[PDB]
Design goal:
This is part of a larger assembly, with 8 protein chains of 8 kinds.
Chain B (H helix, E strand, L loop, with lengths): L6 H10 L3 E5 L5 E4 L10 E4 L13 H7 L7 H5 L1
Antiparallel strand pairs in B: 1-2, 2-3
Chain D lengths: L9 H17 L1 H8 L7 H14 L6 H20 L7 E2 L2 E2 L5 H8 L4
Helix pairs in contact in D: 1-3, 1-4
Chain G lengths: L2 H11 L5 E7 L4 E4 L1 H13 L7 E9 L7 E9 L4 E9 L5 E2 L8 H12 L3 E2 L28 E6 L4 E6 L13
Parallel strand pairs in G: 2-5, 6-7
Antiparallel strand pairs in G: 1-2, 3-4, 4-5, 8-9
The chains are: A mainly alpha, B alpha+beta, C mainly alpha, D mainly alpha, E mainly alpha, F mainly alpha, G alpha/beta, H alpha+beta.
The complex binds ligand 8Q1 and iron/sulfur cluster (SF4) (2 copies).
The ligand CCCCCCCCCCCC(=O)SCCNC(=O)CCNC(=O)[C@H](O)C(C)(C)COP(=O)(O)O sits at the interface of chains D and C.
Chain lengths: 140, 80, 87, 112, 385, 54, 181, 165
């Protein structure tokens, strides 16, 4: 309930009405994505995570819980991602990249040459549960 | 009298006060030590035989290691 | 007294010489109403080099819009005789 | 300002060729002042070398190659005006200001 | 606008620094660095060297953080070779990486101070640099270009009594940091020269590929030792300081705090240093001992091969990065199966930082330009390669 | 051989890394009172000296 | 966000025509794309919520003389949001201009200048494309495999002209190539 | 905020209280001992591993150690070493030419590591500045002269470092 004083990130201003901003952005996103063909994996994935984040935003009235439930950083960084998705939606509509070409070909390599434990390796850890739900929803 | 124009030699003369003679080499260069702790216990010096026109390359190889703390053996022990 | 324009009679000969002096131009087809492309056997690249020579001669820049309108001698002449920066 | 896309046809390429030649020629007085060439060469000789360069490449039919040549010419010209590397009878890469060739080459060395 | 062509031409500021500034009186409008004055074709030369012969080129890129680049190159080769490094070697490599971090920060901080007029801390800090330079000389025989960290481990074991002399250094180093701080931190002139100078937001830092202190100054918690750990950094306790304002004063405080954290790491490496080999045992990639080479046919054959042909690296390509004192130092290595690298692209943090001088110095005073170059910590060996 | 450089039995002595603080100064009212008293009494003394010089 | 998730999620979400090759490996997840799609693929990866690739680490060229398109341009990218790296590569030749990504990542500006300097690959819409490392008036592209190691010219002071001048190289002792294969 | 805290802030500003502290610590080092070395009478510390001027070594009999294997020439990252060799009149495999260009060499020590007979070493000498470039083109005889002059120190250093290599 307490107003956030700082995000600790230089140039990222605190957004006091983050809940109202996020609900607006997600609702706008769920309309603009309908210009994409329904069979495209981009449209499916975008709807999947926008809906869950919207449902969380609707349920919780305290931005601290919204941050806690989503696990995706501060509400100000959630607003940035929501704005960027809306921008990407506009570009992808204009680009028209949809559809598989006639003589489509794609080589896939899965190289299993191991690397030592000691060399640098990114190991971020498990993502929030929705990422895996989105992925398995895309597979099916 | 070299101390008046040559201040580098004077610093060695002053630091020589209270020092111990370790040895003399073939060229006449004299080697001194203090056994204290001012520059982290590093108190090895050479007083070159020539009070003028001295040069660092005049230290023989037997004493070069001692002077640079590379070894604890003096030039005499190495030669033996 | 002052003046802003170079007399036309002074301009025609100056354009007449620089085309004669320009190579690939025999000084016999150089009638003052000649076309660099049709009457002078000059390609487009040679024609571009002629307007450049006149710019330097009269000391002033000629815009692309008007660089193209100078396709003949009489046309190059008129433009300079009425242009006040020509000096 | 930015690098333009590759020319669609030889009309677009030629418009660009003409544009470059105009810029190269319009910088000639600046070059003459920088290298102090008033008593070495005439400005038209500078113009002839530029038009020569262009005429030696009149057999190119691919607009992509023409664009690359124009880009390299623009780069070469910018260095000559901004970062002059003065050499007496040489501006950039341009020399400014009874026996056959075999016997001369034979007299010189064994490598022709 | 009139143009000012100011190139600091001596150790005062870098030395090959050449800047074209457009001014409005004393206010800077635009800054254009002209580089390549130290471009020596290192990437081209590496393609003509075996993997061992290319190693000394890394000491001479960021020539203030020598061993940190040797580590990055060795890690890249060990990655493509799938070579396992003994634990003792990993601790020695981390120990000297943090020693190399202190050497870097001591120089960066006190050379920046001398340029704004604080002449004393340079002299105090360089006597501490000499002590650490002695440790480089005792393990490798060179004060700067050690060539000590190698693929598979380190060139030689530590001489007896070195760990004790490093411990005696650590006992007194906190006092040396406190004196540098007491000279600068609280001083009103120092604060006036650095507070709100060269402000960078987090978005700007990510857009311009900033890393290291230049990125952590803007409040972005990102250190490659924690994000993508290597060697034994996962068994060590240290904090990652981050800024809250993103100006030159936060980056100064971070570099000071990073030397205290480097001191903390060195203590843990000293205490946890295990016994064992300092070189990977495989007999295809590491030199034999002198006694073995002079007594065993197999060892002599391997020694002959290693110092003439060098080892081969299977055909592949990868990007390897470490947290160098100046930021993320990366190596894009392309192997074609032979004994020489096919391509070695060197990603230098100072290349990204110097490119951002234009936006950082915008609308600042002329005398703030050197302050901004100081907080970027530019060494042109790695900018130009 | 088998002897390698390392910690002594029990490890090295603990070392501090944090900034040790220092409270050195009179500060505040001490300096202001000293300066004000000096001004008042010294100006009185200036008057006395001027009278003697007169 | 591990490399397993990136490979799978990119297969499901990206438009199919963009990516011609996908390599999942401990050496790095790599996406090969045609030149006409490089700009759009890099804008997708930057803006999309589940990728958030915000940092361009660097751009480099590789010369493959045995290939019809001899140059490979490699984009090493980083997501600080998800702590993951991605490699996007595309091929080019000596005359085909490829798209510049300065409008996406301002840090690409000097790296694309280096690629033009070192390899001769040109970038459409680059605000200021000129050599950045080599000497002014330099001829050739030194990182091409057919460019000689010691170059073609060298400089010296010339007292009669009172200046430093450039002349064809003369080597007192040649580079010795030791073929150990 | 408070008249007492405002007062203290103002007084600290006007009387330069933090500038006094910087003066006090500056004066403390004025009276302390100095760290300056009185070169050339006094020298800085070095170690047995120090990589200095190259030297060619002999056996105690006077025979050269080098057998012209050319390993040092092959490994040299700067290509600073040039070697010619042929069979000696007694059938021995020996160099007729061994040049090190001291102005190309990077003083890496790779040559000393590569040598199988301890023939080429980087000795401890670092004071060999010259007045000409040609004096830094060392031929075989100059290198063997260095070995004779520095042999006593080189041998002691090798005994010291034989426990680590
Ligand atoms: C100061 C010096 C620095 C600047 C100089 C740099 C070097 C300059 C050279 C670079 C420019 C080129 O070669 S760019 C290549 C120029 N050539 C082409 O455009 C190929 C196609 N040919 C044609 O279009 C015609 O033959 C043509 C005669 C051009 C006109 O057409 P006309 O036949 O209808 O007159
Ligand atoms: S020190 Fe290194 S560069 Fe110099 S000669 Fe020996 S091996 Fe070659
Ligand atoms: S010095 Fe040593 S490595 Fe070099 S040729 Fe002679 S024996 Fe071989």
């Amino acid at each position: 309930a307490k107003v956030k004083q700082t995000t600790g990130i230089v140039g990222l201003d605190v957004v006091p009405n983050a809940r109202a901003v996020l609900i607006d952005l997600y609702s706008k996103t769920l309309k603009e994505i309908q210009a994409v063909p329904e069979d495209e994996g981009y449209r499916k994935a975008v709807e999947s995570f926008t809906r869950q984040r919207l449902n969380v935003c609707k349920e919780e009235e305290d931005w601290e819980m919204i941050e806690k439930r989503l696990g995706c950083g501060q509400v100000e960084e959630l607003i940035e991602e929501a704005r960027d998705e809306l921008t990407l939606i506009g570009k992808m509509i204009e680009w028209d990249p949809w559809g598989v070409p006639d003589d489509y070909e794609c080589e896939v390599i899965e190289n299993d040459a191991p690397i030592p434990k000691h060399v640098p390796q990114h190991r971020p850890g498990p993502l929030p549960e929705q990422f895996y739900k989105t992925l398995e929803g895309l597979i099916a | 009298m070299r101390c008046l124009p040559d201040g580098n030699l004077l610093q060695t003369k002053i630091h020589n006060i209270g020092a111990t003679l370790v040895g003399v080499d073939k060229f006449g260069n004299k080697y001194y030590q203090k056994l204290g702790d001012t520059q982290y216990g590093r108190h090895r010096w050479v007083e070159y035989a020539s009070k003028d026109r001295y040069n660092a390359s005049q230290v023989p190889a037997e004493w070069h290691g001692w002077l640079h703390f590379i070894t604890d053996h003096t030039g005499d022990e190495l030669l033996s | 007294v002052r003046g802003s324009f170079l007399d036309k009679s002074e301009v025609t000969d100056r354009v007449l010489s620089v085309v004669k002096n320009f190579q690939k131009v025999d000084p016999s087809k150089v009638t003052p109403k000649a076309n660099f492309q049709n009457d002078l056997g000059l390609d487009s690249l040679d024609s571009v080099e002629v307007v450049m020579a006149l710019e330097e001669e009269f000391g002033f820049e000629i815009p692309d819009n008007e660089a193209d309108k100078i396709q003949s001698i009489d046309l190059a002449v008129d433009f300079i005789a009425s242009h006040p920066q020509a000096k | 300002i930015g690098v333009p896309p590759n020319s669609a046809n030889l009309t677009e390429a030629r418009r660009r060729v003409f544009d470059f030649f105009r810029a190269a020629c319009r910088s000639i007085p600046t070059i003459m002042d920088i290298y102090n060439l008033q008593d070495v060469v005439a400005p038209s000789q500078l113009r002839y070398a530029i038009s020569a360069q262009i005429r030696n490449n009149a057999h190119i039919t691919d607009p992509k190659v023409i664009d690359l040549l124009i880009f390299k010419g623009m780069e070469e010209l910018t260095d000559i005006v901004d970062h002059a590397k003065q050499r007496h009878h040489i501006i950039g890469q341009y020399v400014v200001g009874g026996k056959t060739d075999f016997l001369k080459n034979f007299y010189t060395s064994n490598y022709f | 606008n009139f143009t000012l062509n100011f190139g600091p031409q001596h150790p005062a500021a870098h030395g090959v620094l050449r800047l074209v500034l457009e001014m409005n009186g004393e206010v800077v409008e635009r800054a254009e660095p002209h580089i390549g004055l130290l471009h020596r074709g290192t990437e081209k030369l590496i393609e003509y060297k075996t993997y061992l012969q290319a190693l000394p080129y890394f000491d001479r890129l960021d020539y203030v953080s020598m061993m940190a680049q040797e580590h990055a190159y060795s890690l890249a080769v060990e990655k493509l070779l799938n070579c396992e490094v003994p634990l003792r070697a990993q601790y020695i490599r981390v120990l000297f990486c943090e020693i190399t971090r202190i050497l870097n920060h001591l120089l960066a901080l006190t050379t920046h101070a001398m340029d704004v007029g604080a002449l004393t801390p340079f002299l105090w800090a360089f006597e501490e640099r000499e002590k650490l330079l002695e440790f480089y000389e005792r393990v490798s025989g060179a004060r700067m270009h050690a060539s000590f960290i190698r693929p598979g481990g380190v060139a030689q074991d530590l001489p007896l009594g070195l760990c004790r002399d490093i411990d005696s250094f650590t006992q007194q180093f906190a006092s040396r940091i406190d004196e540098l701080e007491e000279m600068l931190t609280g001083n009103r002139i120092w604060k006036q020269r650095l507070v709100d100078i060269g402000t960078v937001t987090a978005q700007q830092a990510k857009d311009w590929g900033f890393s290291g202190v230049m990125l952590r100054g803007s409040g972005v918690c990102w250190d490659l030792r924690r994000a993508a750990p290597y060697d034994v950094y996962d068994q060590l306790d240290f904090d990652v300081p981050v800024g809250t304002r993103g100006d030159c004063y936060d980056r100064y405080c971070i570099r000071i705090e990073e030397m205290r954290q480097s001191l903390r790491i060195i203590v843990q490496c000293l205490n946890q240093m295990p016994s064992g080999m300092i070189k990977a045992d495989d007999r295809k990639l590491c030199p034999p001992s002198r006694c073995r080479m002079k007594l065993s046919m197999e060892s002599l054959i391997h020694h002959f091969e290693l110092y003439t042909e060098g080892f081969s690296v299977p055909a592949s390509s990868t990007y390897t990065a470490v947290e160098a004192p100046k930021g993320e130092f990366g190596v894009f290595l392309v192997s074609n199966g032979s004994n020489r690298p096919y391509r070695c692209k060197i990603r230098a943090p100072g290349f990204a930082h110097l490119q951002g001088l234009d936006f950082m110095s915008k609308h600042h005073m002329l005398a703030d330009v050197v302050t901004i170059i100081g907080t970027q910590d530019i060494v042109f060996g790695e900018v130009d390669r | 051989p088998l002897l390698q450089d390392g910690p002594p039995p029990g490890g090295f002595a603990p070392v501090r890394y944090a900034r040790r603080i220092s409270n050195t100064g009179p500060s505040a009212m001490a300096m202001f009172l000293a300066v004000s008293g000096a001004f008042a009494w010294g100006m009185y003394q200036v008057g006395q000296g001027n009278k003697i010089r007169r | 966000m591990d490399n397993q998730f990136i490979f799978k999620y990119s297969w499901e979400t990206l438009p199919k025509k963009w990516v011609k090759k996908m390599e999942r490996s401990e050496h790095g997840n790599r996406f090969d794309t045609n030149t006409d799609y490089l700009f759009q693929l890099l804008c997708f990866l930057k803006l999309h919520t589940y990728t958030r690739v915000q940092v361009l680490i660097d751009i480099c060229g590789v010369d493959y003389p045995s290939r019809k398109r001899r140059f490979e341009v490699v984009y090493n990218l980083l997501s600080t949001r998800y702590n993951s790296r991605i490699r996007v590569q595309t091929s080019a030749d000596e005359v085909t201009r490829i798209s510049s990504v300065v409008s996406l990542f301002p840090s690409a500006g000097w790296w694309e200048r280096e690629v033009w300097d070192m390899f001769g690959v040109s970038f459409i819409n680059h605000p200021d494309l000129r050599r950045i490392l080599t000497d002014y008036g330099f001829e050739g592209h030194p990182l091409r495999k057919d460019f000689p190691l010691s170059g073609y010219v060298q400089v010296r002071y010339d007292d009669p002209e009172k200046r430093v001048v450039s002349e064809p190289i003369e080597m007192t002792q040649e580079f010795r190539y030791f073929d150990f294969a | 905020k408070d008249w007492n805290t405002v007062f203290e802030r103002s007084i600290n500003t006007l009387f330069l209280t933090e500038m006094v502290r910087g003066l006090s610590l500056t004066l403390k080092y004025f009276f302390d001992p100095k760290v300056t070395i009185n070169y050339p009478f006094e020298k800085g510390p070095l170690s047995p591993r120090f990589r200095g001027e190259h030297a060619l070594r002999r056996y105690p009999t006077g025979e050269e150690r080098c057998i012209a294997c050319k390993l040092c020439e092959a490994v040299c990252p700067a290509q600073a070493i040039t070697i010619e060799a042929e069979e000696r009149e007694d059938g021995s495999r020996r160099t007729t030419r061994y040049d090190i260009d001291m102005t190309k060499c990077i003083y890496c020590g790779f040559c000393q590591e590569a040598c199988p007979v301890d023939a080429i070493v980087e000795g401890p000498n670092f004071e060999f500045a010259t007045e000409t470039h040609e004096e830094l083109l060392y031929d075989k005889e100059k290198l063997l002269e260095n070995g004779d002059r520095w042999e006593t120190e080189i041998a002691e250093n090798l005994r010291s470092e034989s426990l680590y290599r």
